Amino acid sequence: MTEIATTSGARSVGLLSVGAYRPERVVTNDEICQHIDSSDEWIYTRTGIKTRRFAADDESAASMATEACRRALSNAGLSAADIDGVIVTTNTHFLQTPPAAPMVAASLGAKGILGFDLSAGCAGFGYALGAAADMIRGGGAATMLVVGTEKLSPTIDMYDRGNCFIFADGAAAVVVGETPFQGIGPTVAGSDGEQADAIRQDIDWITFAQNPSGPRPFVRLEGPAVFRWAAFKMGDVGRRAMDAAGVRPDQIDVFVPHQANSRINELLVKNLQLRPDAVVANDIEHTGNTSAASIPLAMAELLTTGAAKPGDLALLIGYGAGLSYAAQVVRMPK
Amino acid sequence: MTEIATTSGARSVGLLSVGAYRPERVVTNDEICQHIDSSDEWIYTRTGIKTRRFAADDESAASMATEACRRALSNAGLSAADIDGVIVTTNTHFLQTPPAAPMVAASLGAKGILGFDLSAGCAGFGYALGAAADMIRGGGAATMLVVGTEKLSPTIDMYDRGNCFIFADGAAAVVVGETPFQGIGPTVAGSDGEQADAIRQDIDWITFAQNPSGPRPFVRLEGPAVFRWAAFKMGDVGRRAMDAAGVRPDQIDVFVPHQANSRINELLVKNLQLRPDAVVANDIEHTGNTSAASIPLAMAELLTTGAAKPGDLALLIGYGAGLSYAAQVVRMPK
């Protein structure tokens, strides 16, 4: 009887490199407070944030994704010609269509390679990485680009006081391909749609379009709800990711949680029973919460300062919007 | 050092069922011809469309995805409790965040299952299907929901004689899980970002938001460009999908191309060398082009009339926006 064929690729997959792009402009809490009622100290105190980058007007999630990919390719010693596909994960591509992925591939000179946009709120990176690994192992690609990119600044209500100092822009990509050793552990993910409102665009685009003189949409954040959720639930997610990867808490060298808030992550570093000398990402201090691009930008920073070395065993935990989370254990890139 | 472990699932994966939801408001060509200088015969002879469905104002891509999934689960004799994850593919979720996936899972009572939104324009279904299959084989889930949903009507410029009669609304989901036989063939996909302009939202949401009194965004289509592209390039894509699946053209029982234009698809049927009695989807006549929901809606239609039977060998070819395409050979569901 005719049977549909089954294919497969390299069983061992890993992060060949990481490339990060940060917008030239810097924005201080004071600059922020020059339109808000609070302190440049109460900010960096309740949220380890001191400064963040805002992209120019002529930039987009797509353009920053492209530059991030160029850097990842160079850091991996590859050219666009070595890439089989690209997954752009973002929440700020301001067009219902076309997707950013095909445009990014074109800008890289990457022919008609497959690609798509993945949106899972802040945890889109973990979902995209897992997807790239599954595709490569399944034989649908051999080498891929996974880039998290975000241009949130244009969606911030400078008068929100609840998040205007939280979100920021930026993009970071990783090259995923075959490695001698297993570099990407099993994906652990889930969500809580019951709390979809905790991080949302308040007005949908069509309603706004039908009421142009009415209020325009802005990103709203129910900080406490998110703070509690992550702090209390990401510890369990961390253990599952380690368990699935067959690793124990004490074997983790690097911890890269979503750069949502220092207070949440410091609490997680303790609840995960990581060893005392475990390196922890704190890229948020001068980058803020870049949602989907957060983790890959944080990984790049840890490597940047040498705090993390290639080969290091890291625990990645993305949590955020939609109330989605995605985690995995990986071997640091570059 | 410590080797990161792996996990794996069922090698044989397939379509357990399909569930389709079509908005109740039927819009005829004559209704469309109240705002353009055309006629029913002109539109029908050139596109193959006679009527299409428009969703109500209180409906959304997410609400239609929910209902489609409910039907799919029922057609598979399963409950939300049997689902491990859900992938929503769409291009008309009018919120930059949160994603529709977490909300859809919540609405189905599928507690906190993993999920994300995937946009590859019109070919998002093929990509999501392949991703679901790769995840299940990768052991990241055992059973999943893949739902294409689209509420394009609000993005249509009623005066655009180039596409006002083309796009429509609807949603259809399939349950993906382990099957005795291999039911999903290898994914064959790619794109042409050089032609990203062929199907696009003309004005990005932020620019509009910063000039509310200016022109609002609408979907635009460069018909001829798309027509030529699909007609000339999908044949090669179909052959590759069949090759990867180890099947010959004559073995295809059912052909389900994206319902973009009946003339493009009639040309493809011939160019693919399908046998004379091959059943070809023509759901477009009363459904129009529902982009991401097109293929699963067409599969449901063929099964409903009994034209396609469960177990039938089918060739699916998604093509569209961003200039993205995704294809695979599968065994019909339900």
Ligand SMILES: CCCCCCCCCCCC(=O)O
């Ligand atoms: C004859 C003019 C009508 C336009 C027909 C062009 C066919 C392509 C439209 C479908 C676009 C898509 O892939 O979603």
